[PDB]
Symmetry: C2
């Protein structure tokens, strides 16, 4: 109710942007700040590198992401908000689709890659004056200027996620499933159950948790019955007639049977044909993960108004989300002040794929170059290194050591494929570390490249 | 921080966006073309390959932190909910030095690279300008072999130079200096301390893009800096570069008989050891000593400074860096040592049969029957993907001339056309002397491998 043009607003802005940071807040910013261990970092590199290999098979390129933009009303206080000097409230990305949709709505007309992936940061606010929590998210998006084969693009996105499942150990040998829904279906269900328009976004948000982390229909009913949402007891009864999932042919029949005599039938039928087409394309793409139709699917439905929704789940007795997405044509249109259509998923790849709970056998560094003579180390050692780098072999110089025992103790936390020790008179002792049945070999320095190549 | 300042702050963060401001934010914005994005992938992929040879891993980069007094109004400044003025990265070294001073995570990787964004503030309400910077850093926990680590950073740059077409056939050079050398020159030339940062900023342009000594002297004598004419004359005695042995001799001669001689000589001995390690690393690009080197010297206080330059008649900067141990200490609250470089890799390397012959997509799967395209086409697609072959599906087309006209702005290695009875017509597009071939669909995989 405050006057937005109140002159106290400019007074405090200029006053605060003139203040230098107070020391208590400067120290509080990153007091208990920790960095991932270098073993975490190598795991992150293997995951990212595997992910890009999958994306590139599809002809995708990396696209840049928006870092900063006017706040969206679609987020609560755990989004990071910041003020620029002329008073606009800005946010850091909370997900990556918001900035991508805004960019697709606002950028000048021009060509955009059809298939693109992006690695960006998303942020969570903490209320202790510390820096925001930061997380790596990866998106894969298919953007077209024509509305042709919309269901086929959607099935390719599901296919990419199926390829990711197959590529990683945390997902390759565990039950996963896809659950497909559709914003038009959900809104027609809301029409069917006489859910008041002012309550639907709140209802969608509670439903997005249904059967995730043991958030059963009883919990859902509570929150929908709370006066913060305010759904009538009869409407919740009707919505519960849709609390199920099933394989597609069955689920399409159930749904048509639920809407049989209603005015909603033709629109639902259009929507089920689209899901059917997606399901059929997924069979052509050879998706191995089980597909379910879940009519109350609603994760981020405000972003996906008018389009398919999908989530990929850990399909165990208690389920959790692996990735989620949908067609966000409607989010693009809602941000226009050049038709563009987009479907994609978002994935927290570090949490789901990189944290430990094969591809991870790759070493940070294959060759350690060492010598017990400090002066040989800093001459011949350097000359071997640049040779190995010139032939694509990963290699690093050791610190000084007095004996093999002392060297391996110093490097007890590291893991190499080979440890090369430079002796006097151009002779190399090679300790093979990636096995244990292989004895140490002395070779001539001139043969190091041949010996390493022939070893593999 | 009276209850006054809070109440207005909370109301500021509740205020709705002005429509004119919301439009201005990204009115007129662009993305790079899809061709630029593929070139960026190739460059980034080659860079990472170089870095991984050294055992390096990618380290995360700080996105947001309390504002540094060193930047002016072209750095992006933002207020958080507690009224602290924060900034977006203006460069990557500031964030890395803060982290190394403020975390206690014990072991950090010794060799690391990072790709981050840096930002420049705009005046017309538009979003900040964004640029992609890449850094390579070597971080150590003792003062042993600092010069060897510095020479390795220089060798990584030499490997980048040899790897890319825009740098491997152009005259390039390294110019080496040292913050202690620069500050001893300032003492020798009687340059007042309040003027040294502005002086070092002017000197960082010396002979870059025709910024000759005449232009430097004008700025040094201006109110931007305010150095005496005597002091500028003495500084000109250092306006040269030479190969290292000859450079060290000239510098010792200029300082002979001064109180600074000992510290100069000690500093020259560090630079000689970097030069000697560079020869052992087999650095191919010419190395010069340039006593007035000063790019970002405030970040490299107490450490070596170096730039990598295009060495044509008109010179320009490729990458720059230095040892920023001193920036780390300056951020300790109320040891770690680091050296590295920074480079705008998109501008220098991605801005345009070579690394850039790699195809965005090797196979286009087409058909002139829409139901075959959407049945057999999908099946061939997933089969190609499952064997690591990059492939995409064409839109509908009525003839090969229509298909080729539609895809004029793309470049594939092969166009596979599906027709009746599991017959494929394969057009070879990466050569020109190769005629079309019809094969059985069950042989597409073998046929492709028989060509590469």
């Amino acid at each position: 109710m405050t006057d937005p043009n109140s002159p106290y607003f400019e007074k405090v802005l200029g006053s605060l942007f003139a203040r230098q940071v107070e020391p208590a807040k400067d120290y509080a910013w990153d007091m208990g700040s920790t960095l991932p261990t270098p073993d975490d970092l190598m795991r992150r590199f293997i995951v990212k590198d595997t992910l890009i290999t999958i994306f590139r098979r599809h002809g995708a390129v990396e696209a840049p992401t928006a870092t900063l933009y006017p706040k969206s009303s679609h987020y609560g206080p755990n989004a990071v908000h910041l003020l620029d000097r002329n008073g606009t409230v800005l946010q850091l990305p909370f997900d990556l689709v918001m900035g991508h949709a805004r960019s697709l709505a606002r950028i000048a007309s021009g060509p955009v890659p059809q298939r693109a992936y992006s690695f960006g940061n998303i942020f969570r606010d903490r209320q202790d004056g510390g820096q925001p929590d930061v997380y790596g998210e990866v998106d894969f998006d298919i953007v077209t200027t024509d509305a042709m084969d919309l269901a086929m693009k959607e099935a390719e996105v599901i296919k990419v996620l199926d390829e990711i499942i197959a590529a990683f150990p945390t997902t390759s040998s565990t039950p996963m499933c896809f659950q497909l829904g559709h914003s038009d279906l959900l809104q027609l269900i809301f029409d069917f159950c006489n859910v008041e328009h002012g309550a639907r976004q709140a209802a969608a948000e509670v439903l997005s948790k249904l059967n995730i982390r043991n958030f059963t229909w009883q919990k859902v009913r509570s929150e929908l019955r709370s006066p913060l949402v305010g759904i009538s007891a009869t409407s919740v009864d009707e919505l519960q007639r849709f609390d199920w999932r099933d394989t597609p042919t069955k689920a399409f029949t159930k749904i048509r049977n639920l809407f049989e005599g209603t005015e909603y039938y033709d629109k639902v039928s259009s929507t089920l044909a689209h899901l059917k087409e997606v399901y059929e394309y997924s069979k052509k793409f050879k998706v191995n993960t089980k597909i379910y139709i879940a009519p109350l699917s609603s994760i981020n439905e405000a972003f996906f108004r008018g389009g398919i929704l999908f989530s990929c789940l850990y399909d165990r007795k208690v389920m959790d989300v692996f990735a989620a997405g949908g067609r966000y044509d409607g989010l693009i249109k809602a941000h226009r002040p050049e038709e563009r259509h987009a479907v994609g998923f978002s994935l927290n790849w570090e949490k789901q794929l990189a944290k430990p709970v094969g591809i991870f056998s790759a070493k940070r560094c294959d060759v350690l170059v060492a010598s017990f003579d400090p002066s040989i180390l800093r001459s011949s050692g350097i000359e071997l290194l640049q040779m190995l780098w010139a032939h694509g072999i990963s290699a690093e110089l050791a610190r000084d050591a007095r004996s093999p025992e002392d060297l391996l103790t110093t490097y007890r936390d590291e893991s190499y494929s080979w440890i090369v020790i430079i002796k006097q008179e151009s002779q190399l002792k090679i300790k093979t570390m990636h096995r244990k049945d292989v004895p140490d070999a002395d070779i001539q320095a001139k043969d190091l490249l041949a010996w390493l190549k022939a070893e593999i």
